[PDB]
Every structure is written in C-alpha cells, then in structure tokens.
Amino acid sequence: MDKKAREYAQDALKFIQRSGSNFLACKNLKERLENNGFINLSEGETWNLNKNEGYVLCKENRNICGFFVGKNFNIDTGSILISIGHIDSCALKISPNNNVIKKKIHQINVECYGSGLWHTWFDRSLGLSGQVLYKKGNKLVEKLIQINKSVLFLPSLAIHLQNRTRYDFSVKINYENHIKPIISTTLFNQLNKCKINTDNSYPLLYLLSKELNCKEEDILDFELCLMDTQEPCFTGVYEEFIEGARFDNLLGSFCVFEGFIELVNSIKNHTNDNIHNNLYISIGYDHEEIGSLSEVGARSYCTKNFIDRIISSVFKKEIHEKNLSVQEIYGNLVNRSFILNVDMAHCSHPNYPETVQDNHQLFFHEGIAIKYNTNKNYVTSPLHASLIKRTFELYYNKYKQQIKYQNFMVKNDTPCGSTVGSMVAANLSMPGIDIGIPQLAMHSIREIAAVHDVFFLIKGVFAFYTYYNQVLSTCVHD
Amino acid sequence: MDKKAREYAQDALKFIQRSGSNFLACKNLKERLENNGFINLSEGETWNLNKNEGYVLCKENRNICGFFVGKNFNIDTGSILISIGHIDSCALKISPNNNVIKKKIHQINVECYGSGLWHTWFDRSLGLSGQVLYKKGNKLVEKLIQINKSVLFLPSLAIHLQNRTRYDFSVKINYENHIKPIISTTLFNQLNKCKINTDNSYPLLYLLSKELNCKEEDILDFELCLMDTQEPCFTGVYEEFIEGARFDNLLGSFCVFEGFIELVNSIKNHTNDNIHNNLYISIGYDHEEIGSLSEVGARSYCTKNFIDRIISSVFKKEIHEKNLSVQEIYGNLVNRSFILNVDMAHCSHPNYPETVQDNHQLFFHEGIAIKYNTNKNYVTSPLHASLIKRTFELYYNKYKQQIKYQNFMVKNDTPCGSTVGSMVAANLSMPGIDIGIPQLAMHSIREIAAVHDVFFLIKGVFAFYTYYNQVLSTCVHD
Amino acid sequence: MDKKAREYAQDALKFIQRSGSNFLACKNLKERLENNGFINLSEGETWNLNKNEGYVLCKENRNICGFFVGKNFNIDTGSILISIGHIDSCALKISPNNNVIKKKIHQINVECYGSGLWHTWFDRSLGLSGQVLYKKGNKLVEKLIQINKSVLFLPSLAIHLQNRTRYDFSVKINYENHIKPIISTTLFNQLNKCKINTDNSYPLLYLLSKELNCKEEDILDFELCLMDTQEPCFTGVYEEFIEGARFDNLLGSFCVFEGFIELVNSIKNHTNDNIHNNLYISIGYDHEEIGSLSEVGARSYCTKNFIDRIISSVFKKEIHEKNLSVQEIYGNLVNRSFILNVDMAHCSHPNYPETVQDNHQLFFHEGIAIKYNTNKNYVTSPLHASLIKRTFELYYNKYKQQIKYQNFMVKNDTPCGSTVGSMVAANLSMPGIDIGIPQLAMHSIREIAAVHDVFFLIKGVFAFYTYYNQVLSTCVHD
Ligand SMILES: [Zn+2]
Ligand SMILES: [Zn+2]
Numbered sequence A, B, C: 001m002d003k004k005a006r007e008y009a010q011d012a013l014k015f016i017q018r019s020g021s022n023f024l025a026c027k028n029l030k031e032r033l034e035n036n037g038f039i040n041l042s043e044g045e046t047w048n049l050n051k052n053e054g055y056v057l058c059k060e061n062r063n064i065c066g067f068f069v070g071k072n073f074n075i076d077t078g079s080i081l082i083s084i085g086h087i088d089s090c091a092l093k094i095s096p097n098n099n100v101i102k103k104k105i106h107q108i109n110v111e112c113y114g115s116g117l118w119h120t121w122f123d124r125s126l127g128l129s130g131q132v133l134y135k136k137g138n139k140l141v142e143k144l145i146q147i148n149k150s151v152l153f154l155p156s157l158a159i160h161l162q163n164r165t166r167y168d169f170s171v172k173i174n175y176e177n178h179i180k181p182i183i184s185t186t187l188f189n190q191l192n193k194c195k196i197n198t199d200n201s202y203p204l205l206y207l208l209s210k211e212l213n214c215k216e217e218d219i220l221d222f223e224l225c226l227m228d229t230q231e232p233c234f235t236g237v238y239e240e241f242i243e244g245a246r247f248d249n250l251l252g253s254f255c256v257f258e259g260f261i262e263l264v265n266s267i268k269n270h271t272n273d274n275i276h277n278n279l280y281i282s283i284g285y286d287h288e289e290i291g292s293l294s295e296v297g298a299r300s301y302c303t304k305n306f307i308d309r310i311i312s313s314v315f316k317k318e319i320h321e322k323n324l325s326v327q328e329i330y331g332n333l334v335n336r337s338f339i340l341n342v343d344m345a346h347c348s349h350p351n352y353p354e355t356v357q358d359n360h361q362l363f364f365h366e367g368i369a370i371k372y373n374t375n376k377n378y379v380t381s382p383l384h385a386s387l388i389k390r391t392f393e394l395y396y397n398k399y400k401q402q403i404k405y406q407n408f409m410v411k412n413d414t415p416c417g418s419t420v421g422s423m424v425a426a427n428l429s430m431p432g433i434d435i436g437i438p439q440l441a442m443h444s445i446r447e448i449a450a451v452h453d454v455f456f457l458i459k460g461v462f463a464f465y466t467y468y469n470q471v472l473s474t475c476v477h478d
C-alpha cells in the first residue's frame, strides 16, 4: 500500500495546486471525469440517459455531480449510492468594490468566506483563483483563471508596536480592518501606468487583463478567491504527510471522485450481477462553509431534481405503460439507498490534549474516521455505520487489503461544526454516514494529513460503492 | 535604478534562501567576501595586517566581521568607519532534550529564540538550518547544515473546538505547550526503523545523519534553527516587493556587506586621497534579538578587541619608536569615527493607523529610514544624521542618483525595541546613527519589503563609506 | 563516590556556617586558597607574576579571584579557563539609619537585598555577618564579624487576627512595614544601660561592641547581613541531602574553588604538556542578586583588568622586543578561552508540577544541570556545551568515575532570572556555559540540595579545567 498510497496522494497533489477555488474544483474534476469517458451533458438541453454510461455535469461551474447508470437497473432490487464531498474551502474571496488606497499602498479588501483560521492567512505569498466575467465584442465571456504567482500579501503587525512576550501579546485580528491584503504601492501603480470604474483596483485589473489578454476596461466583475501560491508537498522526515492548502474536502472530495472513477473502471473493465444494479452518484457540493443554503449547496433542490431527472430519463418507457410515477420509483429506491458524506475530521492534536475525547481519538495513518455526533451534526447512525464497516470487511475478503477505520466523536460539552451529511439525508430521505480522514489545522491555509488515510478513503468510497447491496441483502429486520 | 534595484534584490534573494540561520549567515557572507579577494584570517594564529588589503573573520562561525585597511592611514587625519547589521532573526531553535511523543506523534520541542510573531510560525512547511557537531573517528567534526525540504510542521488548532467567529475567537498561543512542531508519527518511525541517547529525537537524528552521511549515534548535539522552506520571491502585481524570511537584518546586513563590497571594489579599481585614509569595518553581529549580551553579540568585547588588534598590527612599527600607545591611537581615531547601524524599520501599516506617528511615517520605495528615538534606543543624534544626509548629497553630485531618506520616530507613548546602535556606540565610544529600510510584519516568518529601499540602503552604506570624511572635514564647531 | 560525595559536602558545610555573608565568603575562600600556597597579592602594590604559581586577591573584601599561571604559556596554543560563581545571596541587610522603637520594642529596619523568599525569613533565629568599620585611636579599623548566636527575630503575625483557614488566609508581606526584625524591648534596653548617634540602634551597637571589644561610640557604620543561626546539616532519612542557608552559589562557588584547588594540586603534584599551558582563573563575584552592576560585580571592569594585568605581568618581556600588545595577546587567547559559570538550578519540585518543563527536568543526584535558555539568560550554546560534555567523557576515560549531567531549560511562557554567564561573556568576549546543581527552594533562607550533585559539580569544574584544550584541539570547523 506504501506505493499505492503515495501514488494516490501524488494525483491528489496534482489535483490541488490546480484546484485553487471552487470553480477550478468543478473544472478539474469534470476534466478528470471526462478522461475516463463520461458523457458531459448540460442541464439545459434534454436528458437522454443510457444504461452502462457515465455522465458528468457542472451546475453553473460550482457544483460537480458525476453519476453512472448501471447496466441492469432493478426498480424492485436496486439502489442509489451517493458519495458526497463539497468542493470549496475557507478562503479570502475578493469583494466587488475593491479600491483601498491607504498609507500610499494599493489594497484589496477581501471578504472572509467561511469560518477559517484567518490569522494563518497573514504573511502568505497569496495568489488568485476563481471566475472572471469579461467582455469580448458584444458577448459576455466567462473564464476560469488561475494565477499561481504571488500577487497579494496580507501583512501582519510588527511585534514592537504592541506589548510583547506575554500570553502571545494579545493578538486580535479584526476581520474588517486588519484583513486587507496589499497588492501594490501608488508609486509603482502610477509608474507602470504612463508606460473606467473607480470601484475595481487597477493593480488588480491590470493583473487579470494580463491573464485574459484583453483591456482592463473589459473586465466587468469576478468571483475570485485568494489562494496560497506555495505548492502542496509531501512532508515529514519519511515524506509521510501531505499538506498544501484547501484540504478541507478538496482532498476529501478527490477521494470521493477517485473512489468513483475506480468503481466505473471496475464496472467497464473485466466484463457480478449486483454491481450493474445501482445508480452510483458522486456529487461535489458548494457553499458548505457558510451553511449550504445556496442554489448549488447541499440544501438546494439540485441533487433531488438530478435524481428525479435520472429516474425520469432512464425509466422513460416504463412510466407510460405500467403507470408508475417518479415519486413511486424514487421512494422505492430510497429504501436501498445510502449517502456517504466525506469531509475531513480532527486528528488528535498533541499540543491540545484538552480538546479531544478520551476514547474517540483520531491518529494519522490509523484509518478512516467515522464521525458520530450527539446532535446529528454528522449523520452517522450506529446501524448505518455497521453496514459500511461490513463493506470494508468484504473488501478485505476480495482484495486482501484491510481498510482501517476509527470512530470519531467530539466531546459532549464542546460544540462541533455541522456537515452536509444530514442536509442531503433530509433532502433525499436517504440514510447516511459521515466518514473522512483525520487532519490537523482544519480550516487553515495549510492543513496536514496522512498519506495512508488517502489510500483508506479512496478504497473506502470504492468499498461502499462495490459492496453495499451485498451487505444490505444480508440484513434482516423484525 | 529599476534594473539595479532588482539586481540588488536578486542577489539578496540568493543570499537569503542560503542563509537559513545565523551560522550560514556568517558562512555565506564570508564566502561572499572571499570572492572579492579578502584574506581570511583566523583569530587564533597571529595578525600581520597590510595596507590596501581586505580581511574577513567569522568569530566562532556566528559573528562575521570584514574590514579593509586603507592604503595611507593617517593617525592625525584618518577614521574608522563601521557599518553594523546583526546576522540573526527570531527563529524557533531546537532544544537539547527533544523527544516528545504525545498522541502517537513524534515531536520536537523548540525554544522561542528572540521576540517573534510565533503565531505566524504556525502552519508552515518548516525546515532546518544551523550547526551540527558530530563525531568522525576520534575527532569532533563541525558541519553547517541546510535542509531546504520540509521536515517539520507546527500545526494550529482547528477552528471547531473553541468558540468561533467573534473577536478572532480568543486565540492564545501558549509558548511552551502549543509551540512544539510535529516531525513524524510513531507508526512510520517504527516502520522505517526495522528496515543510544533517549533525549534526541530519532526522526530528527535520522534526518541529520542522512545529511551528514554518518550514523545517528555519531550526532552529539547541535544548534539548529527552524526556517521556512518557501523560497523568497518578488511579489506584488508589478513584482515590486520582496519577502521570504529572516528579513530582520539579514536583508539589512546584506546591504551592509554589499555596500562594503562596492566600496572595496571602488578602492581597488580605477587606481581620491581620503578614500585610502580610513579603516572601513563591516561587522555582522549575533544575538541581537535577545539583547546582545553574548560573546559574539554587540555588548561583547569582540569588536573592541578587533580594532585594538588592527591598530596594533597596522601600526606595529610606530608604537616602538615614537612611544605611542594603542589607547592613544584608538582615542585619536574615535573623534573621526562613526557607526552606521543598519536594522529594519516599521513601514506605515495601512491596516493599523493607530500605531504610527503622524509626521514620522515610513512608506515603501520612499527611502532609507533614519530612526530617531526618545530614549536613544536608536543611537541617531540630529547632528550625526546631518552628516550622513550630506553624504547622501555628495553621492548625488557624483553619481547623479538620489539617495532618498525619511525620518522615522515611534510614538511617545508606545515603546519600541532597542537596537545595537547604542550598544556598540557605548562599547567603542564612537558616534552613531540608526538607519534601515521600512518593512512590514517585522519579526515574523514572512516580512515584506520594497526593492527600491534595497537600492537606497546599498548606496546609503556606500555613500557613508565614501563621503564621510569629506563631510566631517567641513564641520566647524565653536 | 558515596564517601567522596559526603566528604565534599562535609567541607562545604564547614565553608557555609563560616560564610555568613559576602564578606566572609571572600575571607574564607581566600583563607582556603592560601592554605594550598597561593601567593596573596594586593591590587595596590605591583604585579610581578611568575609561572607555576597560584595567586589570590580579594578586591575590597567582596570579590574573590584566584588564578593559576601555567608553567609553559603559549600565546600561540594556550587558553584562559575561567570558572565563575558569585559569592552572595538574598539576605536581609541592615539599613544605615536603624533605630525603630515601636510598641515598646527595639527593632532594626532591614533592607531586602536581592529577590528572596522573604516570607521564609519570618520566624527565624537570625544572626549577623558582615563588615563593621570602627575607630581605634585615629585609625579606621575594618573587621569582619560573625555572630553565630541568635540576636534577631523577624516575627510573623498571629493567625487569629486575620481571616483563617482558606486559600492560605491571604498572606501579604509588605516589604517595608512587615519586614523589620525585633532585637530587644525598651525595658531591657534601659535595664541593661544603667548597669552618641541617634540613628544606630543601641541594642545593635551594644552587640557589635561586645564582639569587637570597644566602645559603642567607636562603631561608625557597617554593612551587615542577617543570617540564620541554624547550622547546615545532612538531611533526609539516609542523610542524603544538604541544607542550611545561602546555597544560591555559596555552595556552588565552593565547588568552583574546590574544583580549582584540586586542579592546582593536580598540577603541582605528580610532577601532561597541555595542563601547564593555560591560565586557570576562578573568580567569585559579588552583587549578582541585584544585577551585577557594581564595582565588584560581573559587569565590572575588575575581571577584564585582572586578565590584562596577568597578561602584562607574565608577558612583560615579550611585549618589548617582538612588539606585541595586550589586546593582541588577549584577543589571541580569547579564541581558546572559555567561561564556566556555576549557579544553582531549579530541581523538579514535586509539589509544583506546573512550573517545570516536561523534557528538561532536574532531579536530585542525577547530575550537573546544563542550563539552556531562550533569551540567553544562561550563556549556554549547544556547541559550547558539547565541548564540556566531552570533557566529562575524558574524565570518565581517566578516572573511571562518570560525571552525570542533565539539560535544564525553563518553559517558554515562564520567565527565568538571568545569571552572570552572559554578563562576563560579553565583558571578556569569551564563549561560555551555565552549569549548576539542582536545588529546591532557591533564594530562600533554607535551600535543600543533593550530595551527589556536589561531587559531580566539583569533578565537573575539574574536568573542564583539565580537559578543555584536549577537546578544543579535536574540533574542526569549516
Ligand atoms: Zn469541509
Ligand atoms: Zn533586526
């Protein structure tokens, strides 16, 4: 696994450093799915879905959703298997009116998107990734940009100005005042000008026009996210960790789609009856960090309408002549359905032993977290994790490679952030689980994670895809 | 100057990224001085100094001190011109007993050297630079190592565990407990072992033995400093800033020695009487961040004994036969002497307008700071800055390139950190000034500075070297 | 070692109980050095120093400094080895105007010298030690007194008067008001009078006149320190500890001079080339507890002028005819020089586990502390402790007795008191180390320490004296 765990983390470290925002997360995953032969269908034309074919759609370039229709569906004995991991992170997005000129320094005022460690974003060689809408002729042209060179810097305050050396000197980052990255000075802005809107920064507008090869006056408005220009890398002495940026479920949703790609490649190659019996959906949501209340979030009707469009297009012919309905067929498959929500989990911090549960601890290379909660912030029920642990045991009987797992639970007094596990499980009425891999410094600009956990997560989504209905057929209720 | 300012910042960005600590600061500057032909003399043999020759000495590989004896000294009309910038920074040095195994994670406990923004050191791909003493046979072998790959990581706490989203969530970095970088896990430490001292970390001892090509049992003890593995780079949209690490007077003492190298090259080439009339010393101190109370610090007798060894070796023949003394000759040259202390200064932060003086502000590309103080934490007197501003005007009359300057003064209510200006001016009884270039986020792991200020500082040390006695001859007291 | 460790602590317990102050510390050490044959030379006559002879000088009876000139000095290959431990402690010194008559009780108002546990000085049978200047005829006669009987008592407040039994009843010792020892009542002062200055206490003036055998009117002024009259003793069940008083480096500077005496006795007896090659200085400083800013402190020019007087008197003949200077010769020997600062260290307190570092702990009988620091309050560098640990290994190869050591480091958040390690290392420009032995209740009136650590310290100073140049010759720098 040492070789396959490093090869899995290598491709994840090719995915991140190209996935600088939520837009290039949808773009690079759609490019990753189209390399295996997925038919890229748009939401706006018409859906004529076929058996045995895989499909992919970016809903308005924020929400990736790739699904694979099995060969023999059975309305009677079949399932809809969904793996979920949001494609976004806590980033400093750029405000619309950004022209801050203070102390002879051109600045951007950025909006803090999500709930992040914003003091870690201080003193970083920052870049740009996101979506820029610009004019070309009479047509609005949309381009996803990726500026991997350092063009922004959020400077900290020098230590000499406040009181020093005690209780970490009472550092307080005011989110409006102190979080405003510098981009240029007014000296070299005017020096690089002689060789229309006053709301956009001309150092910024010169930068995007250099990337898009147009005038700065053609740049209309943009949704840009600040990213750290430092490439992700294997760390530790033994090159045993991974870290670069955005590992809050951009590493995790890589394993959602890498586990989904290996499933479809296992279905298409070497062609055993129940693998062609399911609808395997793999959706990368947006706007998780702010609560999923969006048109492309988890609380959206987007996924629920996607399944009701797959059911209507696949079973187009059997609605008419045996008088079934969509909600009859959808509620028929919901009993055999499942949701595998993948989002990162808190590894046991060695420097903070007071924020960890005693029994439910997570360590690196120890396996997938299975995140439980008091208040169902994670949707894991002890029945529905027992089915997934038996999919990990059916993986061990066939591939002779153990998928390790470990139960994670936050302390009863401390609160924890909710995920999209129970959001989609309420929208789709499907049972669910919340798994993920342990990482340290979650919601920060650099997040460290283990490379064996990337192997266990990719095989963990693949084992849930392959062996869920083999476990579900053996469950007898009263 | 645009071309020469970028070329000066380019070589500074070659100096830093090789100067990872205070030891490789002495090593790379001694290599930089020996490329121009400086005679590397050791403290332990004998000093036979000559006219017209330049010398360089690392005092126990921490304190660099390069000096140039002019061709015609005059005890009557001659000077000792000293430029000073310490070669060290706030870094996380490694403790001697470093074997921290908590939560199945191998850690280093590091000692916070200096007064730094230690919350900025969190979540950085950290490396190693410093001095390692190891055995080879029966001989203690000393080697200066530089590990530019990321082998350490100081992780932050995840945001979900404390209270969130208000007043920056009451972040408090306990300096002992929370500052302990992780280096490995106990899984891959034991996994990479089967394929003597219990105080040193075996993940660390495996790492240094891999660099030194010896056994881990030969590594005795080391003075290692954690550095950030990210290379320094030109930033801004117009590539107009510089930042990587350690810019608290490792950029500034580069300009001390780059201004010193250009002086000696101006003396040796194109061979006008008073340029050969002085002793130009350029010393890079250690241990400034902790108060210079050391054997290689500014409060040491090292510099005072160096001048009394230069005076004794140059004027070896005139002591005997006209019955002069060292203190007679040293106090004769102290009246014409000067100290140019170079250390970085606080640029006007746009996000913190309450910590800046109204009239004494520093902006980027606006010139050298001339740091004044109430309590003489900076040694600048208004007489002795008036001589240096006239050396900047004599530079403009010859080279037709203006050396811009700006006066810097901290507010009366806020305290500021003292420098080595008044420390060496008391030890040597020489008048002084405190100049430097404005930078933001001083004493942090990433410090941003302007590239025109690097040009003004290098020409500023060069103008003080070339034109001080031309200004000093025109001063008439009562 | 059990026999030699008890014999070493026995002579230390003869030294303390005669060393009641800083004056009798200089006196008894000068008597201890003169018993081995050290030539007692005064500062005021002339220095005609010889090879192979040992010298001793009390600078104005506060600062002891004994040195031994080796037989064959080599300016080329030779060294100055200095061991340092201050001879003073936190004591209640007597104020000049001491006539406090309150509530019919004669009192002394004492000045709190140093930073001590002054609540431990309450309720002690206190004595007197120090220097008394008195007249005899027309001549000012100076006498060092030692009153080992209890003549003073600093009483506490009874428990019934404040609130009781909770959180240690809010004890607050006001340093002026509550620290005033009673000495007599006005009843027995007047009763013992019938059988000039109003500023001195007549109960005190009767006491010193009884010791000096003169009138009370001849006593002019005095520098007296209150001491505890209880003799030091071996404690524990197994007689395994030592405690009496003043063990903050009066026990430690005993090991400085006992390690120095055993060196000189090893040089004179059994007469191998490099032992006669060095200048072994052993200096006992004063005024450490208040910051060494004194004429006899560590920040004084006393030690720096002593070495420049030894170099001038030993090399009196080679200055003239090969035209060397003092600062040339002094800076030649500084490269091979070292400073061994000895001051006590904090043993791991069992009742206070929150004030100790986790990895850098000190236990009794576990070895010498090697005190490291963040801010170089201790002058120990990891290079220069690596040389001293190899002097401890060269001791083990010759004497077959292991000198145990243990690294000590205070926590990063807590501050620690600075020592004279970096003070003398700045004044002399010599590299240094801070060693010492672990003790509990430092700066208190009773301080407990271990008897094996007294053996390790005496052999530790002796191993640094004997084997430093054997280690220093094997170091190869780049
Ligand atoms: Zn997430
Ligand atoms: Zn500095």
Ligand SMILES: [Zn+2]
Binding pocket: C086, C248, C249, C288, C343, C344
């Ligand atoms: Zn002490």
